[model samples]
Target chain A: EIVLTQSPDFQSVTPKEKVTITCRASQSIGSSLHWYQQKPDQSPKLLIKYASQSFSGVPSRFSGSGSGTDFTLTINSLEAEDAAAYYCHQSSSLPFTFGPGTKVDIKRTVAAPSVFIFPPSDEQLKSGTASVVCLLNNFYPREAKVQWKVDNALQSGNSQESVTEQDSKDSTYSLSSTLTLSKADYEKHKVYACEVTHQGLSSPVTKSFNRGEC
Target chain B: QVQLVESGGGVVQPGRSLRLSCAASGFTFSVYGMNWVRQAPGKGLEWVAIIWYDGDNQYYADSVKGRFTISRDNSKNTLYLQMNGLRAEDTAVYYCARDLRTGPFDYWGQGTLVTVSSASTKGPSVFPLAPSSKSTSGGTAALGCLVKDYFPEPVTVSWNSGALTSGVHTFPAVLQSSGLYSLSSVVTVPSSSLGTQTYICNVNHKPSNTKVDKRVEPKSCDKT
Candidate 1:
């Protein structure tokens, strides 16, 4: 097995800035060095192969150069979306190894979402069941986790969550989750909870619905 | 659409052998190669082996060199990972992925779980599933992690998205016919959030305090 080491474990860069990341193999691995770009939570995408060869469909701004033990991945005029981790992999020998990733942070601002919980409508109660919803508004960086619980118990199967919605004007996002249960559960008196977590918030935001209180 | 599905993995005794397979579809099997990646019950990703597309060349990770082999049958568009001397630590989810010259292993198998034990067990073997799109109108995606074949049933599944921890749900562990226990945990996020952020699934088993982390990303998504 070959040992692969990368320098400058992390880098924070702005758009249009030229970025260079390097990797070195403990032993000679020839031109087998390849480069990949992995965006936040995304799988790695091959950018350069066989040292300096560019991969098909990859942006021309991304290129590679090196041979043997040392290799470099260069991004010219980095785009804001280009903020991601870059890794070097070598196929020269058995047990392919990868360099510790170099994370490229763009320093974008985080926007936290506001939470809102709503009780089931009268129509829903007509069916001897009701659905409660929790909504988050104006969150950024796109993703957040939301869950529905009843009587402090995490509920599953009967819950539905909305896709993150972007506010085109501001680029912030909104999302929602709904939980359906027997109306008797609420009349029989149950606490329905909605919890929201986001990178922008220091702690999780939660709201509860209790119609029995009324 | 290119697809890869892995099959043939189960229980194996210590010092025994096991074979896991990956079937390729919608592409030229003869022209593209396959790679085998594995994760022990509570470890990170390990690239164990690879076979060149033409089947003329193959390589094994130095860690698995002698005990592991990679091969393929172009006619059937299938790749195989064969292990000679399986140890308890050899237990894991073996994933077979496509080697497209154009990119890295973008296409992957769902993975097959293999267990190595002889009456006594150590920890749970976990398999983190790649985030997949749900047939939901709301544009939501589901991330799953599977913890199985563990002796103890008191396992915990947690999601790491920095401070984000909403929309997480875990199922109780159920005893399998084989006498082992398995549990699944899911985290829901917007499909749009995928490809832009990462969500990690961590499985913690007691006693040895064995912890396995699986980072899942979206393979692809559809808005409608």
Candidate 2:
């Protein structure tokens, strides 16, 4: 079975992503290549037409390239819904053969932490004292860190992650944190801020509470 | 822009011979050979026979040679096929395709449909299916069962680890021009199953009507 083989037996992709799969023949067989998409329990659907021709009903995002013994099928901006196994068939030879199926799974999508600060609990508002809570919500990956500060001074604020709750309906996470401070600092109009950092985030999210608090 | 079209019966009785035809258009009639392939319902493709392009030679898969004959007419650019002593298991979609020197089925005629009753052949020499396993993600493993050169119809394939049983999923089988069938199935097993280091692959098909079990060794500790 050295007739035909495929590259990268598996792939993990995300929506609006790009993917390229190649099929190499033992010998050159010219433009007689075709591609198919097969999901569980369903007949494989034709993808690339005769190496590069576009077939009816196939998405425009899917394209074909190469010739002879080598061919490629590129799925531009791969959609989450199209996640499945893709296969290449070489019609240039006798018996005809299919590449080992390429399994493309849609990688889990992540939502960056959106941060905010709210007035602290009333229980801590007595004795001319004020407290603030930093909230991090709608985040993903269940991984993030919050650093609290008052007037540029780092505060070892206690944080209680809400059990890293998952949305369940989609691939995202929701959690919050709390940062308590004294009333003297609140009355001084200090820059009570919290910086939330996550892997999915492009940069640390720093949001400060406005003046006048509980 | 060339096309191949096949036409035949939707049903054939048990022990009856079967014949199917292939027509080619928009291409040279004598430059290439026409191959006969078939697939039963919910099964894989089977290569039945091939007629040389020069028209002087022909080849039939060993399993099909005695009962299958392939012929062509250069004048009309059409191909003819006849399979004798057909059984009930012969019910399938037959396709005639052009080949590139044993490389691949370049152009295929839309398949012709046929049906046969109860008894047939072309299953197994009791071929062994080897299941390959490796790491996936989050302490999970994917087990792939490649069942090649098998026949008749779909086969039962599965994976097991201790008390947990995982069903293997199959894709369409690819019939060789030599009249053989090839198929593959896969199932995902949990990581602890790999730790137990006791993975078994099971397969079943008719005629033989027996279960074939294979033990797969996984190197879980070494996999990162």
Candidate 3:
């Protein structure tokens, strides 16, 4: 059997930037090539194939053109809705094969403020401590590192963290992070933050919390 | 305004079986054949099998052999498909289609989604065949045969000259969207070896112990 191999494991492309991927067959596989995109938890949607045949329900900006042993997948104008991993597969053979996905991320040119805490303030009795939680919404590539920081210094003690990944109909990746701070820390008006680090990005995202005891 | 609809429960767990039904409301189910196609959560479409009102059925590959059964309730104008031995890979969008006989899918039903979280068996592996041919030193030459079907596993094609060779051989084949496939491989031997040589295409379909074999011979091309 001719094995198909894809290069660069992963790729990062900015909006409107031309993205190119290569699918090589161990032997000649004719001109059978089809591409699909999966956001995260959604079903895969056909993009393009057979060099240029477009499947129904596919976007016009999405176009495929290639033949013989080589093929290419292109998206004319990448939209926020187009931000997802794309795969190339062959239907000419049995037990079809897929290439490792290449995730396309939007290039963030301007850095946003690090801390934006929801629910500005809270109060609790002296005997009880307040708990503040910070969540990071709409994050892709779930492998990002998350940590809690206090007062501009990485907080090291008595911290609780929870991370969960969920997928939607479009297959886009979403991650949620919850950090619980002790009542004592909450009373001190300590600046609690959650930071996420990923590859091929200009900077990390840090969200802060301000809920505290009165 | 004619449409076929599929209805079944959602959220099937791993290790469990699933049965879905495709019911035609405005059309005659008996007049056309009903075909089943599968699409994994993040994969392309795969032909599962087809069931006709005459009780005829054909599967794509071996793994689904006996594990899947396609039946039609002509009285209800509905088709039933039951798949046992579910696995994580089985979690896909299952669609029912009307066979157009021509190439390509024309009429299709809204697909039913089945997700198998876990299964006792691993998913099947499909491989591509090499493009090569063999011919006799001086007599009629035989190009190898190409096997096409939606089987999820690797299939073996063998050329026999009294004994089976140690290495497996493959030839490239063309596939049509209609689920029909054709491939050609070449075999060369002495003219005297014709008639005595035999070729077989064997595929290891899962859940069943059945092997498909097609025999052919290379003879001198003579004008009819």
A100-156: candidate 3 lDDT, tens digit per residue: 566665543322221222321222223243333333333444445567677677765
| lDDT accuracy of residue B183 in candidate 3 | 32
What is the TM-score of model 2 when looking only at chain B? 0.51
Which fraction of the native contacts appears in each prediction? 0.12, 0.03, 0.00
Worst 10-residue lDDT window, candidate 2 chain A: A159-168
Best candidate according to TM-score: 1
lDDT of 1 by residue, B1-224 (tens): 77788888887788998888888898878888789877664334567788888888887777778998888998888899889898877877787777666235656667788877664455876654444322112577555565656874468778883365676556545545456665656556777887678788887888447888877655433334
* Candidate 2 residue lDDT tens string, A43-102: 455677679886677789999999878888889998766777777776654445566667
Candidate 1 chain A lowest-lDDT run of ten = A162-171
For candidate 2 chain B, the 10 contiguous residues with the lowest summed lDDT are B126-135
CA lDDT, every model vs. true structure: 0.70, 0.62, 0.51
**Tens digits of per-residue lDDT for model 2, B108-173:** 666777866442444542222221221243554444444444545556666663344433334455
Scored against the native two-chain complex, candidate 1 gets a DockQ of 0.10
Predicted structure 3, TM vs. truth: 0.46
Q: Is candidate 1 or candidate 2 better by TM-score?
A: 1
Candidate 1, overall lDDT?
0.70
Estimate, for each residue in B19-91, the C-alpha lDDT of model 3 and write its tens digit: 9998887777677777676666444455676665565645443547678888888788887788887765676
Writing each residue's lDDT as its tens digit, candidate 1 over A107-210 gives 34688876655555444467575656565655776668988878788877776555432333455556656566677776765677888889998998777745
